């Protein structure tokens, strides 16, 4: 249900910059997170890109894109990651076929997650990795939880930071388009496709990252 609750708070160092990577979920969170980090005099490079994921690595390789971004800017010391909504499907590699959630599939996906973390560590950067919050479609939601377990396990092993989102975007342990705001009033945080964020939802995601910074 919940692997662990991450209470880590990072102290930010002068001149250090942020890099965002991920899919259209990160694009939506990025709008809010950029504004919040801008307000703290922090520079942001936002590479988030629609229709990407670790499972689509042959179409767009986030490990290559991330490595190149660090190469172009030695001042990036914080990597923020939110992806996976496009990823929970069988993977074919040549004649080899890997059914989603099978042991070999998990090996491949875990390796792709680890590659991202190792690239940040090689460039002396720390990693904030968002848990994908629940989604409305039951079948997709079940698969997303497999992804989130992998992210959390890899982040734990590499001693980076995992941003818990499941509780904050759930009501009575299930998906909800609405949550309570800071004053206990109901606010719409998910768009009607049951996946993406409203502006208020994006700000709530951004707040969860900011709660891992001091
Ligand atoms: Cl997307």
Numbering used by the authors: 115 to 328
Give the article text.
Taken together, our results support a model for peptidoglycan acylation in which a tyrosine-containing peptide at the MBOAT’s C-terminus shuttles an acyl group from the MBOAT active site to the SGNH active site, where it is transferred to peptidoglycan.
All three forms of the enzyme were active as O-acetylesterases and had similar kinetic parameters when rates of activity were measured with p-nitrophenyl acetate (pNP-Ac) as donor substrate. The native structures of NgPatBΔ100 and CjPatBΔ113 contained electron density consistent with sulfate and chloride ions in their respective oxyanion holes, while the selenomethionine variant of NgPatBΔ100 apparently contained an empty oxyanion hole. However, we observed that the highly conserved signature Gly residue of typical SGNH hydrolases in the block II sequence motif is replaced with Ser161 in NgPatB and Asn165 in CjPatB. Structurally, this results in a type I β-turn of the peptide backbone at this location, in contrast to the typical type II β-turn found in most other enzymes of this family. This altered geometry and increased hydrophobicity appear to be characteristics that delineates these O-acetyltransferases from the true hydrolases/esterases in the family.
